[PDB]
Amino acid sequence: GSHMNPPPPETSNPNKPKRQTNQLQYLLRVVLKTLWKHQFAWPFQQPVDAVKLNLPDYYKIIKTPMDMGTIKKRLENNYYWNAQECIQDFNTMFTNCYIYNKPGDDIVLMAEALEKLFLQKINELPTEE
Ligand SMILES: CNC(=O)[C@H](CCCCNC(C)=O)NC(C)=O
Numbered sequence: 001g002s003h004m005n006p007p008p009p010e011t012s013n014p015n016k017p018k019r020q021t022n023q024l025q026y027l028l029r030v031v032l033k034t035l036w037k038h039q040f041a042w043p044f045q046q047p048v049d050a051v052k053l054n055l056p057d058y059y060k061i062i063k064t065p066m067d068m069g070t071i072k073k074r075l076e077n078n079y080y081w082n083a084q085e086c087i088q089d090f091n092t093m094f095t096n097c098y099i100y101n102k103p104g105d106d107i108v109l110m111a112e113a114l115e116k117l118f119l120q121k122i123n124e125l126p127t128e129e
Contacts (some may be wrong), residue, residue: 002051006059009047011073016081022129023083026069028075031090032119033129035068037058040110044068044093061100066092085124090118 035041046069050058057064060082066089080086097111 001049004051004056005047005049006065009070010069011077011079013079016079018078019081020078021082023125024075024078024080024086025082026126027086028072030124031118032068032072032075034117034121035114036072038114040113041068043107043110044114046098058100062096064092065096066090068093082126087122092120 003051005011044067047065047067048055048058050056068090071086071089071093074089075086094111094115097107101108
């Protein structure tokens with residue numbers, strides 16, 4: 001894509017420690033699956049294209065971008081060490097939306113719907129086995 005968008009967050013790195021846990025499996029099979037198919041997921045399914053959206057300040061404001069396409073690939077590629085690393089990426093995605101956009105805005109209402117669902121599912125994250 002455009003040189004004015006940053007490289008997306010990495011989804012592979014042989015230097016990073018990785019493991020599968022039952023909590024990470026739940027984050028893929030239950031949490032990400034649930035959020036991904038929601039009516040309001042689409043703005044979150046890939047990195048923000050600030051060029052296409054005509055938002056040239058987006059990567060000046062948001063210095064820790066994150067999206068669910070990145071999270072999906074990180075889960076599928078077993079990139080994470082633990083559930084906390086994955087939960088933080090979801091938390092980062094939601095907070096970026098709330099920092100960059102205004103309380104009334106369509107994208108904020110969309111994020112809030114996804115976040116409500118996320119919280120329902122994380123409250124049920126299984127005991128680590
Ligand atoms: C051109 N503007 C849009 O398309 C809007 C606003 C997008 C803001 C950037 N994305 C995020 C996730 O913060 N997207 C809608 C309203 O769904």
